[PDB]
Amino acid sequence: QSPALIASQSSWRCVQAHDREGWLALMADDVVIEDPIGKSVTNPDGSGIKGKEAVGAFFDTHIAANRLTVTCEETFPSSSPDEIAHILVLHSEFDGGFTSEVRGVFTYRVNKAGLITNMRGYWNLDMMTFGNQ
Amino acid sequence: TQSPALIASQSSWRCVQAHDREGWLALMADDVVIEDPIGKSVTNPDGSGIKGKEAVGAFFDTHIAANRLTVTCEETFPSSSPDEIAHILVLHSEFDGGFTSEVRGVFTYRVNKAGLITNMRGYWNLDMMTF
């Protein structure tokens, strides 16, 4: 198992586990999370969430007042043990029965130490589905 | 209006299928890097990708020579930036002599402000290829 694979798989288990300290242990001090890439609700300036404090906030905000599934549909290794891509499905269910889902490509890059420097999501609000119950 | 990233991605598969080398290079920024795949492999010998129009020209030549290359987009994943996009692509080679070669990967593309490809990056390796 490559470092990029251990890291990305560990990052889904830690959100499954709602395990904030284990999630942050996976991150480099210079981590940038672009979920999604570009200006969006979860990326207000289009530039990403930078550094472990900010990314901790991101974790805290995301796991609050909703059930947050991340399923790996498919994995695409590259030829670098430090970079990898996956198709993931994300489901949040907030209060009253709401309900957002998105399916995206996510790419991950780790440093020489095995820690996440980048996580990048290809999705936008037009691809997201809303529901009730 | 399709995004600059999507126009560029779709044009690059059209240029390849038309064996249009000048069309293909007109899509590229002068600082273009192509990592097909990311990391060391037959098509990325030093692992840092193919850099610049001249080198990316040579890449085009080597991939289409004696080859019936089809590039089929199975699925497209826009981002929230009109300059970055990802696709699942099936790259199918049928060389002269009849020998088949195939890979299905994730490819990401980035364009600059002019709409020219700065990056093209493939998530595949030789262990994923079929024959």
Ligand SMILES: C[C@]12CC[C@@H]3c4ccc(O)cc4CC[C@H]3[C@@H]1CC[C@@H]2OC(=O)CCC(=O)O
């Ligand atoms: C955009 C969201 C789903 C839609 C929600 C939403 C939907 C409609 C609305 O009027 C307000 C809000 C506020 C919170 C909004 C959510 C914040 C994160 C969530 O979407 C993400 O979990 C998708 C994947 C990810 O960013 O990890």
Ligand SMILES: C[C@]12CC[C@@H]3c4ccc(O)cc4CC[C@H]3[C@@H]1CC[C@@H]2OC(=O)CCC(=O)O
């Ligand atoms: C199939 C190739 C690796 C993938 C290249 C390739 C990769 C992507 C693409 O869009 C087109 C092509 C056409 C040329 C393709 C190469 C021709 C020979 C090369 O494969 C060999 O290095 C290994 C062959 C074998 O494992 O038997």
